[PDB]
PDB file of C-alpha atoms and ligand atoms in Angstrom:
ATOM      1  CA  UNK A   5     -12.756 -20.105-103.777  1.00 45.81           C
ATOM      2  CA  UNK A   6     -12.569 -23.984-103.917  1.00 46.18           C
ATOM      3  CA  UNK A   7     -15.587 -26.083-105.175  1.00 47.87           C
ATOM      4  CA  UNK A   8     -17.572 -22.861-105.995  1.00 47.76           C
ATOM      5  CA  UNK A   9     -15.544 -22.401-109.264  1.00 45.10           C
ATOM      6  CA  UNK A  10     -16.452 -26.061-110.082  1.00 46.21           C
ATOM      7  CA  UNK A  11     -20.101 -25.306-109.066  1.00 45.91           C
ATOM      8  CA  UNK A  12     -20.046 -22.295-111.495  1.00 44.63           C
ATOM      9  CA  UNK A  13     -18.750 -24.494-114.446  1.00 41.91           C
ATOM     10  CA  UNK A  14     -21.712 -26.879-113.967  1.00 43.43           C
ATOM     11  CA  UNK A  15     -24.347 -24.071-113.756  1.00 42.16           C
ATOM     12  CA  UNK A  16     -22.988 -22.367-116.924  1.00 44.10           C
ATOM     13  CA  UNK A  17     -22.927 -25.668-118.866  1.00 44.25           C
ATOM     14  CA  UNK A  18     -26.542 -26.352-117.703  1.00 45.37           C
ATOM     15  CA  UNK A  19     -27.606 -22.762-118.713  1.00 48.48           C
ATOM     16  CA  UNK A  20     -26.201 -23.175-122.298  1.00 48.94           C
ATOM     17  CA  UNK A  21     -27.707 -26.740-122.687  1.00 46.60           C
ATOM     18  CA  UNK A  22     -31.137 -25.279-121.579  1.00 45.74           C
ATOM     19  CA  UNK A  23     -30.858 -22.297-124.029  1.00 45.22           C
ATOM     20  CA  UNK A  24     -29.896 -24.629-126.981  1.00 44.09           C
ATOM     21  CA  UNK A  25     -32.868 -26.986-126.113  1.00 46.15           C
ATOM     22  CA  UNK A  26     -35.335 -24.004-126.009  1.00 44.00           C
ATOM     23  CA  UNK A  27     -34.069 -22.732-129.412  1.00 42.46           C
ATOM     24  CA  UNK A  28     -34.298 -26.185-131.105  1.00 41.66           C
ATOM     25  CA  UNK A  29     -37.837 -26.821-129.683  1.00 41.74           C
ATOM     26  CA  UNK A  30     -39.023 -23.452-131.059  1.00 41.73           C
ATOM     27  CA  UNK A  31     -36.930 -23.736-134.375  1.00 39.92           C
TER      28      UNK A  31
ATOM     29  CA  UNK B   2     -46.987 -10.166-142.819  1.00 42.86           C
ATOM     30  CA  UNK B   3     -43.746  -9.239-144.667  1.00 41.58           C
ATOM     31  CA  UNK B   4     -42.538  -7.327-141.581  1.00 45.02           C
ATOM     32  CA  UNK B   5     -43.736 -10.267-139.368  1.00 45.85           C
ATOM     33  CA  UNK B   6     -41.351 -12.595-141.322  1.00 46.56           C
ATOM     34  CA  UNK B   7     -38.439 -10.083-141.071  1.00 45.58           C
ATOM     35  CA  UNK B   8     -38.929  -9.654-137.250  1.00 45.29           C
ATOM     36  CA  UNK B   9     -39.154 -13.477-136.802  1.00 44.77           C
ATOM     37  CA  UNK B  10     -35.933 -13.975-138.864  1.00 45.90           C
ATOM     38  CA  UNK B  11     -34.220 -11.133-136.841  1.00 44.57           C
ATOM     39  CA  UNK B  12     -35.273 -12.687-133.475  1.00 45.00           C
ATOM     40  CA  UNK B  13     -33.999 -16.140-134.639  1.00 42.01           C
ATOM     41  CA  UNK B  14     -30.638 -14.663-135.750  1.00 43.39           C
ATOM     42  CA  UNK B  15     -30.204 -12.756-132.458  1.00 42.87           C
ATOM     43  CA  UNK B  16     -30.904 -15.942-130.409  1.00 42.46           C
ATOM     44  CA  UNK B  17     -28.346 -17.848-132.592  1.00 40.50           C
ATOM     45  CA  UNK B  18     -25.770 -15.043-131.794  1.00 41.84           C
ATOM     46  CA  UNK B  19     -26.694 -15.349-128.037  1.00 44.08           C
ATOM     47  CA  UNK B  20     -25.914 -19.108-128.101  1.00 41.23           C
ATOM     48  CA  UNK B  21     -22.570 -18.657-130.058  1.00 38.29           C
ATOM     49  CA  UNK B  22     -21.444 -15.851-127.646  1.00 34.28           C
ATOM     50  CA  UNK B  23     -22.265 -18.045-124.559  1.00 33.72           C
ATOM     51  CA  UNK B  24     -20.456 -21.069-126.118  1.00 31.74           C
ATOM     52  CA  UNK B  25     -17.290 -19.023-126.910  1.00 32.88           C
ATOM     53  CA  UNK B  26     -17.270 -17.481-123.386  1.00 32.33           C
ATOM     54  CA  UNK B  27     -17.731 -20.979-121.763  1.00 31.54           C
ATOM     55  CA  UNK B  28     -14.934 -22.590-123.880  1.00 28.02           C
ATOM     56  CA  UNK B  29     -12.386 -19.742-123.416  1.00 24.96           C
ATOM     57  CA  UNK B  30     -13.054 -18.872-119.698  1.00 25.24           C
ATOM     58  CA  UNK B  31     -15.114 -21.786-118.167  1.00 30.92           C
TER      59      UNK B  31
ATOM     60  CA  UNK C   2      -1.041 -16.360-103.112  1.00 31.18           C
ATOM     61  CA  UNK C   3      -0.320 -13.223-105.213  1.00 32.04           C
ATOM     62  CA  UNK C   4      -1.468 -15.072-108.360  1.00 32.00           C
ATOM     63  CA  UNK C   5      -4.485 -16.456-106.371  1.00 31.87           C
ATOM     64  CA  UNK C   6      -5.593 -12.818-105.689  1.00 28.63           C
ATOM     65  CA  UNK C   7      -5.067 -11.802-109.370  1.00 28.92           C
ATOM     66  CA  UNK C   8      -7.110 -14.830-110.664  1.00 26.54           C
ATOM     67  CA  UNK C   9      -9.901 -14.101-108.105  1.00 26.68           C
ATOM     68  CA  UNK C  10      -9.992 -10.394-109.164  1.00 27.46           C
ATOM     69  CA  UNK C  11      -9.992 -11.477-112.896  1.00 24.47           C
ATOM     70  CA  UNK C  12     -12.880 -13.966-112.332  1.00 23.79           C
ATOM     71  CA  UNK C  13     -14.880 -11.258-110.443  1.00 25.28           C
ATOM     72  CA  UNK C  14     -14.313  -8.706-113.248  1.00 29.04           C
ATOM     73  CA  UNK C  15     -15.333 -11.214-115.957  1.00 29.51           C
ATOM     74  CA  UNK C  16     -18.580 -12.075-114.071  1.00 29.29           C
ATOM     75  CA  UNK C  17     -19.313  -8.298-113.707  1.00 26.62           C
ATOM     76  CA  UNK C  18     -18.831  -7.967-117.554  1.00 32.70           C
ATOM     77  CA  UNK C  19     -21.179 -11.017-118.048  1.00 34.25           C
ATOM     78  CA  UNK C  20     -23.936  -9.286-116.013  1.00 34.10           C
ATOM     79  CA  UNK C  21     -23.500  -5.859-117.825  1.00 36.27           C
ATOM     80  CA  UNK C  22     -23.576  -7.589-121.284  1.00 40.73           C
ATOM     81  CA  UNK C  23     -26.792  -9.536-120.346  1.00 39.58           C
ATOM     82  CA  UNK C  24     -28.430  -6.336-118.958  1.00 45.12           C
ATOM     83  CA  UNK C  25     -27.621  -4.305-122.128  1.00 43.32           C
ATOM     84  CA  UNK C  26     -28.896  -7.134-124.402  1.00 43.17           C
ATOM     85  CA  UNK C  27     -32.156  -7.452-122.314  1.00 45.48           C
ATOM     86  CA  UNK C  28     -32.816  -3.650-122.329  1.00 47.29           C
ATOM     87  CA  UNK C  29     -32.078  -3.126-126.070  1.00 50.68           C
ATOM     88  CA  UNK C  30     -33.695  -6.341-127.508  1.00 49.31           C
ATOM     89  CA  UNK C  31     -35.952  -7.855-124.735  1.00 48.34           C
TER      90      UNK C  31
ATOM     91  CA  UNK D   5     -45.049 -16.450-132.405  1.00 53.45           C
ATOM     92  CA  UNK D   6     -47.634 -15.031-129.873  1.00 54.08           C
ATOM     93  CA  UNK D   7     -47.188 -15.570-126.052  1.00 54.03           C
ATOM     94  CA  UNK D   8     -43.799 -17.352-126.631  1.00 52.45           C
ATOM     95  CA  UNK D   9     -42.046 -13.933-127.132  1.00 51.56           C
ATOM     96  CA  UNK D  10     -43.663 -12.864-123.796  1.00 50.79           C
ATOM     97  CA  UNK D  11     -42.568 -16.237-122.267  1.00 46.58           C
ATOM     98  CA  UNK D  12     -38.968 -15.500-123.481  1.00 46.94           C
ATOM     99  CA  UNK D  13     -38.963 -11.966-121.829  1.00 43.14           C
ATOM    100  CA  UNK D  14     -39.865 -13.544-118.454  1.00 42.70           C
ATOM    101  CA  UNK D  15     -37.207 -16.329-118.688  1.00 41.87           C
ATOM    102  CA  UNK D  16     -34.452 -13.813-119.622  1.00 44.09           C
ATOM    103  CA  UNK D  17     -35.425 -11.448-116.771  1.00 46.31           C
ATOM    104  CA  UNK D  18     -35.406 -14.452-114.349  1.00 44.88           C
ATOM    105  CA  UNK D  19     -31.961 -15.600-115.712  1.00 45.28           C
ATOM    106  CA  UNK D  20     -30.375 -12.119-115.110  1.00 42.70           C
ATOM    107  CA  UNK D  21     -32.005 -11.769-111.595  1.00 43.84           C
ATOM    108  CA  UNK D  22     -30.567 -15.275-110.715  1.00 47.86           C
ATOM    109  CA  UNK D  23     -27.051 -14.364-112.049  1.00 51.89           C
ATOM    110  CA  UNK D  24     -27.020 -11.013-110.089  1.00 50.76           C
ATOM    111  CA  UNK D  25     -28.154 -12.868-106.862  1.00 52.28           C
ATOM    112  CA  UNK D  26     -25.367 -15.522-107.285  1.00 55.38           C
ATOM    113  CA  UNK D  27     -22.718 -12.778-107.786  1.00 57.35           C
ATOM    114  CA  UNK D  28     -23.856 -10.727-104.729  1.00 55.97           C
ATOM    115  CA  UNK D  29     -23.999 -13.869-102.480  1.00 57.78           C
ATOM    116  CA  UNK D  30     -20.422 -14.785-103.488  1.00 55.15           C
ATOM    117  CA  UNK D  31     -19.162 -11.061-103.516  1.00 53.13           C
TER     118      UNK D  31
HETATM  119 CL1   CL E   1     -27.826 -17.173-119.164  1.00 51.95          CL
END
């Protein structure tokens, strides 16, 4: 359960950043 | 039109709620 | 241990809730 | 607002499929 929790934090941050970018580019 | 504007506004609002829900979840749980 | 098991179970449950919430949202709104 | 709504359906389906895969692979 070590670096996988850290790996999860990074994927979730990336997922939200992507979603925000998509929204702004559309409007 | 008219209903096209309403559906577009509804879809925008729902996506804004999706972002806010994801942000809250990330900040509280990580 | 003990609290390691509880936190692991909690994290698993939360991820299961994340999936169910996303599925519901997809099916109802698309 | 044409094919972008269709484009959104496909990204969301892909996002859920990915999340389910990640969960199953972990346990
Ligand atoms: Cl997502």
